[PDB]
Structure formats: C-alpha cells, structure tokens
Amino acid sequence: RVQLQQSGPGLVKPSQSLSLTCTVTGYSITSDFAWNWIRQFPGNKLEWMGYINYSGFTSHNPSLKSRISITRDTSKNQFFLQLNSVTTEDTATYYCAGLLWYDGGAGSWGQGTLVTVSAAKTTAPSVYPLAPVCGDTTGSSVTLGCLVKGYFPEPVTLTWNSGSLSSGVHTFPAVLQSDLYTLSSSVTVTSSTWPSQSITCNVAHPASSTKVDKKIEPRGPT
Amino acid sequence: RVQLQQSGPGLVKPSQSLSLTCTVTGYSITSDFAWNWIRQFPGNKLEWMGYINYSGFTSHNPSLKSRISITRDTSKNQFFLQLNSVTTEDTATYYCAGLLWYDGGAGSWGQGTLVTVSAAKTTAPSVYPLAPVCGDTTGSSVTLGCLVKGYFPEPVTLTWNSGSLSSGVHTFPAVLQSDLYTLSSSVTVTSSTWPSQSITCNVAHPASSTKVDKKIEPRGPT
Amino acid sequence: DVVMTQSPKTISVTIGQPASISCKSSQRLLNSNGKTFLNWLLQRPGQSPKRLIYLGTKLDSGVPDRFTGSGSGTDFTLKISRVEAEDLGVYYCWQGTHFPYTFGGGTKLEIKRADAAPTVSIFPPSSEQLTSGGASVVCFLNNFYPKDINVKWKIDGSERQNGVLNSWTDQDSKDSTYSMSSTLTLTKDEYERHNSYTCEATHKTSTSPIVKSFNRNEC
Amino acid sequence: DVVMTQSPKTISVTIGQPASISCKSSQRLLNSNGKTFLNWLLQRPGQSPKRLIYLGTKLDSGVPDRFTGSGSGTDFTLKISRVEAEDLGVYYCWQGTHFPYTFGGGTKLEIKRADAAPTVSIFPPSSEQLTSGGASVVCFLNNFYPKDINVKWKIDGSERQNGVLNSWTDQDSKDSTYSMSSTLTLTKDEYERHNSYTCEATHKTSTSPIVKSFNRNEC
C-alpha cells in the first residue's frame, strides 16, 4: 500500500518561510493520486491547503493566496510545501495526504509534523527520574515515573527501555509554562520485576538534537 | 529579455535544510531553457549544482548526492533549490541561471544571494557617522563617511540619500572581527555643497530587519 | 466557501451499540458528473485522520463494514452498526465537490464503559531536580472512568492550588479509560519547609476520596 | 570529473591592448552531435557571471565582437581585440559536454592605467561610538593606482600596528583606480590618553608619504 511521511522544521521564526517535505513509498506520485497538504490547528480545526496531482497540476486554497507553492521531485518520489511570511497563526500540525483523483478513495495520510512559529529560543529538556517510596514497593504492583521539564519547542518523544516496554505506559500531553514545556510519563509493571530489572526513561528532543536516558533507581538504600 | 532573481534566507543553522527560490520574468520556464542553480565559494570557485529544464527534467551534481532537490512551480514561473543537512562548508553565494537547452547560449544569471551556515546569532549593526574636521572643510573637495560595526550575518546594503547620491561613493568589503562584521563607506562631493545640503547614510540589514539612517552633521559648532 | 456543519459536537455511546452522526453542507455536493465528492474520516487519539467513506455513500478501502455513509444533496449521515473500543476519536466529513475543499467541525465519539476507580501513585521530587533548585511533586491517576475526576493537593493539611499543573490523556483506544497526572511545583526552599505532602482524588467510584501521601525523611 | 585548468591566474593589461587567456580540459569536449558545449564568462566586480562565448567559438547574444573564442579538442582560448575599462573582472570557462558540468578556476584581468595618487581623509571617532565605550579612527585612501600602497598609523609620533584593520575595493570598472580604508580601533580610555593621531600613506606617486592627522580638542 501507499504510505506518506512528513519531515521539516519543528520551529520557524515569524516572517520566514516554512519548508516541508513528504516522502511517498509504495506508489509512484505520477499515477492516480492527488497529493495534498492539510494542517490542523490547536482547536483541532482542519484546513485544506492544496495539492499537486499525478500529472503535476496544482491547486491551492485562496486563504493562503500568494504565500503557498506546492512542487514535487519525481526522482525521489517526494512533493513539497513552501509557505512564505509565516506568523504565529501558522502554528499547527501539517499533514500530507494522497487521495485518488477520480473518486477520492484510498486516502492515506502521513504521521504529521508539528510546526511552531515563535521567537522563543530552542531549549533542551531536563529529565528527572521518579522512583516510588517504600510503601508502594510493598504491594500489588508498582508505578515508576519520568519528568521532562523546561524545553522548547515541541515535541519530545519518550520511551521506556528504548521501546521494548510499551504496555502499562502513560505519557501525558505537555503543558506550556514560562514558555517552557513540562511533560510527565508513568509506566507500571509487576511489583516483583523492579528493581530486579532496570527501567530506563529515554527522552529525545529533535529541535535541540538531545537524547538522554534516565534509569529509575530506588530511593535511599541502593 | 529573460531575468532571474533569487530570494532565500541569509543565515541557516548547521544540519538544517536550505531553501531558495528563483523568480523568472520575461520568459516561460516551460520553454527552451535549462534552469540552473550554481554557487560560488569564498575563494571564488564556482560549482554547478543542477538544473531542471523546460520539460521538468532534472539533473544534479553527484557531489551533493541525496541532499539536493530541484523543483519548479509553473504557475508562479519559479523554480527552487532544496539542500538538506547543510554544514558550514555550504556557505557561499547561490545563483540561478538559465541557458538554452540546445546550444547553451543566451545565458542569464540572477544577482545571487549570500548564504551563511553558522551557529552565531543574528546581530543588528551599529551605524556611526563620520564627519571631517575643519582643515578639510576648507579646500578643494570634502569626504564624508559612515561606519557600520558589529553585525551578523552578511550582508548590509548601504546607500547615501536613499540612493540619489551614487557618484563619488566607495563602500568597502566588510571584515569579520569577533564574529561581527565591520564595513565603512565614504562619499565625496564639492567642498561647497556640504553642509548646505544634508547627506545621510542609509543602512539596511535584512537578517535582523534593521533599517537605520545616519545624517552626517558637522563636528563642534552646528 | 461551502461550509460543513457537523452535529452533535460530542457523543457518548455504549460498546456494542449503534451510533449516527450528521454533516450538513451549505451547498449541494453532487456535481455535473453524477459524483458526490464527500468523505468521512476518523481521527483516533494521537493518530492522523483515516479513511472510512468516499463518494458520499461508498465503503472505503479496507474499512470495516460496520461503517455506513448515506444521504444526498446537503444532508449526509455516518452510521456505525455496533461501536467498538477503537472507534473513539473525532469524526470529520470532507467535501471535494466545491473549491476550496473544506472539512466539517468534527464530532467526538466517547466510548461508554463500566466505571473504574483510579490507581493513584504519588512521587516526591528527585534528588537531581532538588540540587538544581527546583521541587516537583508528581501524582498519577491512571485508567479511570468516567473522565470526571477532582484532585486536591495538601501541604501539611492545608490545601494548595497555586503552582499546580494537570494533564489528561484522551480516552484510551483499548480499554476506554482515562488517565491524568497532577504536578505540584514549589521552590526548593518552600518544599523543605514542610513535611506532609498529600494527593487527594475524588471520583464517583467511591464516596470517600482516594488518598496518597508521604512525609520527607523516610523513603 | 572533467577538470578545467585556466591560465594565467591573473593578468594585467593596458587599455586599448589585446589580451588572451587559456582554458584546458582534461577530456575532449566535442560530443557525438558535432557540438562543443564550452562557454566563456566574465564576472565584473560585484556582479554575477555574464555570457560571452557559447558553443566553444560562438559570440553570444548581445556580446561586443571584441571578444572571440577559439580552439577545439581540449585547448580553448578567449581573446579580446582591445581591452576597455569594463572588461576587468574574473573570466571563467564552463563545459557542458560532460556530466557533471564544471568551471575553470577563473582568470583575473587587471587594467593598466596612468599612476594616480590617493585622496586621503582621516576621521576621529564619533560622539556616539564614544559614549558606547569604543573608539575607531577611520582613514580613507581613494582612487589610486597602482594597487600597491602602504599605510602607517602613529599615535603621538609612535607607530601603532595592533588593532588596525584594512579593506580594499576591487579595481573600479569605470576609472580603473583602487580605494582602501584603514581603521584603528582602541578602547575609549586608551584613545583619551593620547592627543595626536596620524594616518601615513606611502605610494609610488610621491617619494614623500601623504600625511593626514588631527589632535583631540579643536574640530
């Protein structure tokens, strides 16, 4: 099947140009589809920006008049978006999506890439480990945590044991404070597996090329 | 005739993507030419990056393998350059140029746009006026000056009286000091026209959206 | 432009039950070629919108037959024969008959399931954060239903509201429960000036609040 | 890749005189269609490269006939019947026969004209720069020929070399002269500790150096 994948900056400064790329696999872009760029704003409102179909024909929403350009590179099977003079209003989640030109079916969207328009400077995050106490290390199960504080811009991808520990995990949406994001995450396992088996918090923050691990070690005696 | 004009960022940070645009006027891009992107390095060495011809066909130098993409927007009669994972080595002057596909004649280049790959932060310039003394305000002619110190990145466009005073002008190449550029400019007029007629130094620095004027007023008594 | 009005805004449904949502367009969507470019999409929590219905009434590629689109003219309806846990998320309608193409406001489907009390856990600041001059007391309330829940912080018996930050996860697409994290941030000094730190949760699953706490110096 | 070797590296010529430059390719440039994709370009100071010769020996669009390209195989020559002031700049050859297309190293043509002494001017720091904690004494030496020139700074008679920065303009494409600016930067304090500031220029147009100076407190 067809699969799309977006890539681009996560942060762009006011008045600059936004440049995004969408790599397509499993189908030639010069056949059948309409390759669209759609964005989703904070309140979850969706807006169609435009497309370029299999024959290279383009069409874009008038709400973006003279600021948008959609091109393609048939050699690398990718299409692009160029948005000039961005302002904080352009902050949203950008998606690429292909729908069949003829009837609009077999539509496939990429994962989306967050784009922030701000003057604020990129700040790496701090990762603090959250170990329980001794009253919960004696019972049914155990909950461990990971605190990621003060970073910018979004997002950060967080995993436990580099991704092998997926179940019993909860990563909460980040909250903006002091122009810095804070996000927490908890993982739950059997009260008899930890600390026998190390549990590590892996935090990644693209905007600043940061990647730090944080092992969850027991408080007090170790 | 055909005329090209480049536009794009003046500063880009390491590992990011460079995105340039070339607007073409006086001829359709879907006819006859080969639309090229060429760059010139500090020592004035030229390198061919690639092209996209009238039929949309592309070709790029292997020295940029998998980092370059050249597309076009026939609707706005523009073509573009996308250069991924730039490093300080990518710092150069980027030009767009059209040559006839068939024989290589009628070639036309844009003015070029300086591109700097650095971590250094954008800094607006300081503009100090340079008035003579009283020993040269009594003689043949008179030379006035304008000092532009400590800015980044290049360039700054400097004019006298918003561009009406063009003759007898010398704007010297900037010199990099403390990761900050310094540039001076002198203008010469009849020893009897100044200060009867105000002379102003107009300094513009895109990277920081700065535009400041500096009138040249006589030292001491005024 | 052609405006797409969706209703209801939100909607709660028991698992194994049918559902039905509306999308009304301010302009006819059938074009001169007999086609009606109208699509229905489902955006599960954390995912991107995915296909369901195309051509106004046609089951899209690989979509469970449980979904059925219908209607014509300006009134379109999406139906689900029998809701499943993974059907939760926001449904959107999208018209491609009139340029510029526009989406509806979306309709959020909440899954209805049996009540579930929260598993609460509390965490003192980390040694590392402390040495940095900060202090955060984190409390987790996981896998509960319904979404409504009230958490209260108490420092040595007194309620504390300032400096508290909360964050909820969307309904889980597997068990249909909700989770939440409450965080109390204080200056290192104010933190070390007190001893008791409590996290109080009130939820319809118990008339008496769920309490979790700790005192500095112990574990 | 096909390497293009240009010679000489630089070159000086009197106005009204002929010139001739070379470009040698490491590989034949004639292709299977009888064409030789070889172009000659001139990049005047501050401008972008501009067309001259195409197809190895063909006068390009709107180019003065004074320019003539010739040669075949791997040896190509550019000739100028009689140099004019605006012919100064760097000449480049560019081959489009072998992918990837490459340029030569360029050849710089300097114009020969009558000697011309420099018009020197000196400038004390500005009130504004002073209040900022800085001090720059700027000196200009405009429209001189030849390029060779030596400027010396003296603070109260003693030579000063540290903190001096110079910048030269390329040969002027109209009068063929050169200009230069010399700047002495000092701390506000060191500047206010001295009285005499002199700018000394030595140039073949006078055996005695051109001197310009000023003393704080006057004008």
Ligand SMILES: C[Si](C)(c1ccccc1)[C@H]1CC[N@@+](C)([O-])CC1
């Ligand atoms: C933009 Si869309 C892929 C499309 C949009 C919404 C619903 C179904 C199809 C299609 C493209 C071809 N037409 C002729 O432009 C009609 C709209």
Ligand SMILES: C[Si](C)(c1ccccc1)[C@H]1CC[N@@+](C)([O-])CC1
């Ligand atoms: C890249 Si160019 C416009 C060209 C380059 C240098 C000199 C003359 C022509 C030309 C394009 C068509 N071919 C067949 O690729 C040969 C080179």
